[PDB]
Amino acid sequence: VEKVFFVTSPIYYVNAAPHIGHVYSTLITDVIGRYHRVKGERVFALTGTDEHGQKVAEAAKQKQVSPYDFTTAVAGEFKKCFEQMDYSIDYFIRTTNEQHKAVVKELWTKLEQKGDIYLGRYEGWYSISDESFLTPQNITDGVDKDGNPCKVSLESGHVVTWVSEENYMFRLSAFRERLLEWYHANPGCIVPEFRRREVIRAVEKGLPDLSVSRARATLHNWAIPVPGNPDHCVYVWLDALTNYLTGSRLRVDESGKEVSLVDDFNELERFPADVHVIGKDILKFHAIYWPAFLLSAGLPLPKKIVAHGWWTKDRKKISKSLGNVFDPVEKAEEFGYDALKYFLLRESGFSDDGDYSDKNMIARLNGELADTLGNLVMRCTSAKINVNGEWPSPAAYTEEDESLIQLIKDLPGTADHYYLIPDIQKAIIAVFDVLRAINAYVTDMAPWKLVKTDPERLRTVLYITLEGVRVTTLLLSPILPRKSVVIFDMLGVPEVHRKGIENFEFGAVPPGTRLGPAVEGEVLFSKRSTE
- Applying CB under 6 A, does 11 fall inside the site for ligand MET? yes
Q: Which stretch binds ligand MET (CB under 6 A): 167-175, 238-246, 379-387, 428-436?
A: 238-246
Among 5, 6, 10, 29, binds ligand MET (CB under 6 A): 10
Residues 6+ apart with CB under 8 A from 193: none
Q: How far is the CB of 457 from ligand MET (least distance, A)?
A: 57
Write the CA distances from 383 to 134, 185, 186, integer angstroms. 66, 57, 54
Region from 11-19, 145-153, 192-200, 378-386 binding ligand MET, contact rule CB under 6 A:
11-19
- One-letter amino acid for residue 417 of the chain: H
Nearest-approach distance from CB 13 to ligand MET, in angstroms: 4
CB atoms within 10 A of CB 360: 14
Q: How far is the CB of 250 from ligand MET (least distance, A)?
A: 16
Task: Output 50 or 423, the one with its CB closest to ligand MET.
Answer: 50
For the chain, breaks with the C atom over 2.5 A from the next N come after none
Q: Out of 238, 282, 415, 508, point to the residue binding ligand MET (CB under 6 A).
A: 282
- Strand 275-279 relative to strand 305-308, pairing: parallel
| Shortest Cβ 241–ligand MET spacing (Å) | 5
Strands (E), 42-177: 43-50, 91-94, 117-127, 132-134, 139-143, 149-153, 160-170
Task: Please state the closest distance from residue 37 (CB atom) to ligand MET, in A.
Answer: 23
> Contacts with ligand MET: how many residues (CB under 6 A)?
9
- Separation of alpha carbons 13 and 74, rounded Å: 9
Residue 50 or 112: which CB sits closer to ligand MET?
50
Q: To the nearest 10°, the Cα dihedral for 346, 347, 351, 353?
A: -150
Using CB under 6 A as the binding rule, whether residue 238 contacts ligand MET is answered as no
- Provide CB contacts within 8 A for 228, sequence distance 6+: none
Nearer to ligand MET by Cβ, of 220 and 527: the residue is 220
Q: Does 241 help bind ligand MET (rule: CB under 6 A)?
A: yes
Q: Which stretch binds ligand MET (CB under 6 A): 227-235, 240-248, 314-322, 349-357?
A: 240-248
Q: Which is nearer to ligand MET, 106 or 371 (CB)?
A: 106
Buried b (16+ CB within 10 A) or exposed e, 482-499: ebbebbbebbbbeeebbe
Q: Indicate the length of the chain as a whole number.
A: 531
**Smallest separation (angstroms) from ligand MET to the CB of 234:** 13
Residue 293 Cβ, how far from ligand MET at the closest point, in Å? 12
Asked if 50 interacts with ligand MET (CB under 6 A), we say yes
Peptide bond into 272 cis (omega under 30): yes
Q: Which residue is nearest to ligand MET (CB)?
A: 50
Nearer to ligand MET, 232 or 286 (CB): 286
Q: Count of alpha carbons within 13 Å of 59, Cβ hemisphere only?
A: 19
Nearer to ligand MET by Cβ, of 104 and 191: the residue is 104
Pick the closer one to ligand MET by CB: 213 or 425: 213
C-alpha to C-alpha distance for 106 and 119, rounded to whole angstroms: 19
Rule CB under 6 A: is residue 57 a binding residue for ligand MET?
Answer: no
The CB-of-26 to ligand MET minimum distance in angstroms stands at 12
| Sequence-ordered alpha helix ranges (H) in 206-241 | 236-241
Residues 6+ apart with CB under 8 A from 83: none
Our CB check for ligand MET shows the closer of 156 and 382 to be: 156
Among 5, 6, 13, 265, interactor with ligand MET by CB under 6 A: 13
**Among residues 240, 297, 362, 462, the one that binds ligand MET under rule CB under 6 A:** 240
Q: Which of 311, 418 has the CB closer to ligand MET?
A: 311
Nearest one of 491, 482, 438 to 464, comparing CA atoms: 438
Q: Give the nearest distance from C-beta 431 to ligand MET in angstroms.
A: 31
Interface with ligand MET by CB under 6 A: which range of 4-12, 310-318, 456-464, 468-476? Answer: 4-12
Part in contact with ligand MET (CB under 6 A); list of ranges 7-15, 200-208, 393-401, 509-517: 7-15
Write the DSSP symbol of residue 350: T
- Per CB under 6 A, contacts with ligand MET among 204-233 are none
Least distance (Å) from ligand MET to the CB of residue 352?
20
CB of 481 to ligand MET, least distance (A): 25
**Spatial CA neighbour of 506 closest among 456, 458, 480, 469:** 469
- What percent helix, strand, coil does the chain show, rounded to 5? 50, 20, 35
Task: Report whether 305 contacts 279 (CB < 8 A).
Answer: no
For ligand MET, the binding residue among 12, 44, 92, 335 (CB under 6 A) is 12
Comparing C-alpha atoms, which of 316, 342, 317 is closest to residue 331? Answer: 342
- State in angstroms the smallest separation of the CB of 290 from ligand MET: 8
The interface region with ligand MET, picked from 235-243, 380-388, 431-439, 463-471 by CB under 6 A, is 235-243
Work out whether 368 is an interface residue with ligand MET (CB under 6 A): no
Binding characters for ligand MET, 75-114, by CB under 6 A (x = yes) = ----------------------------------------
Secondary structure of residue 14 in the 3-state scheme:
coil
HEC profile of 361-415: HHHHHHHHHHHHHHHHHHHHHCCCCCCCCECCCCCCCCHHHHHHHHHHHHHHHHH
Q: Are 329 and 372 in contact (CB under 8 A)?
A: no
Pairing of strands 139-143, 210-211: unpaired
Name the residues that contact ligand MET, by CB under 6 A. 10-13, 50, 240-241, 243, 282
